[PDB]
From a paper:
Thus, the ZrgA proteins appear to represent a newly discovered family of zinc SBPs widespread among Gram-negative bacteria, including human pathogens. Here, we have determined the crystal structure of ZrgA from Vibrio cholerae and characterized its zinc binding in vitro and function in vivo. ZrgA adopts a ferredoxin-like fold, albeit with different topology from the classic ferredoxin (fd), that bears no similarity to known SBPs. Here, we show that ZrgA likely functions as the SBP for the ZrgBC permease/ATPase transporter system as it is required for normal growth and survival in zinc-deficient conditions in the ΔznuA background.
We were able to crystallize Δ124-184 ZrgA but only in the absence of zinc. Six protein molecules occupy the asymmetric unit, although the protein is purified exclusively as a monomer as determined by size exclusion chromatography. The N-terminal residues from Asp 22, the first after the predicted signal sequence cleavage site, to Gly 39 could not be modeled into any chain due to a lack of electron density. The same is true of residues 113–123 comprising the first part of the flexible loop, except for chain D where only residues 116–120 are missing. These regions are also absent in the apo PA4063 structure, indicating a high degree of flexibility and disorder. A disulfide bond is present between Cys 100 and Cys 195 in ZrgA that is conserved in PA4063 and other homologues. The tertiary structures of ZrgA and PA4063 are very similar with overall rmsd ~ 1.2 Å2 between backbone atoms. The beta-sandwich structures are virtually superimposable, although the long alpha helix is angled away from the central beta sheet by a few degrees in ZrgA relative to PA4063. The crystal structure of apo Δ124-184 ZrgA was nearly identical to PA4063, including the observation of unstructured regions at the N-terminus and His-rich loop.
Numbering used by the authors: 39 to 111, 123, 185 to 242
Amino acid sequence: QVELNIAQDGHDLLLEITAPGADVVGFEHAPQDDAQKQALEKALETLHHPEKLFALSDKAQCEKREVLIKHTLGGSFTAQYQFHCEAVDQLKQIDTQWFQYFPSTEKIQANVLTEKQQSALQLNAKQTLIKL
């Protein structure tokens, strides 16, 4: 149900993650109080920082090009990140911190496409590694 898609095509790396609102902020309704409003703002703030969620090796020299965040109010969040990496061969793996910022997420269904090489894996808070 949290779904992460990763596609690497030359220097272009696309990461896209779709998550129900309960997986992101803890609730799917409109904030009821200041705590919930701050939780939503903090969550949206983190989603605009893909480098906190999906650390790319500095040796890959990945530049952020586009960030798209959609919130549909069940409610869900989609974050779509586009990087251009100068040294994409230096991108060996990603260690996601998704669960550190969004501990309500139990598991991620991940799909990885590196050129034409397709693989899937299920991540959890203790198994956050993705091979690229």
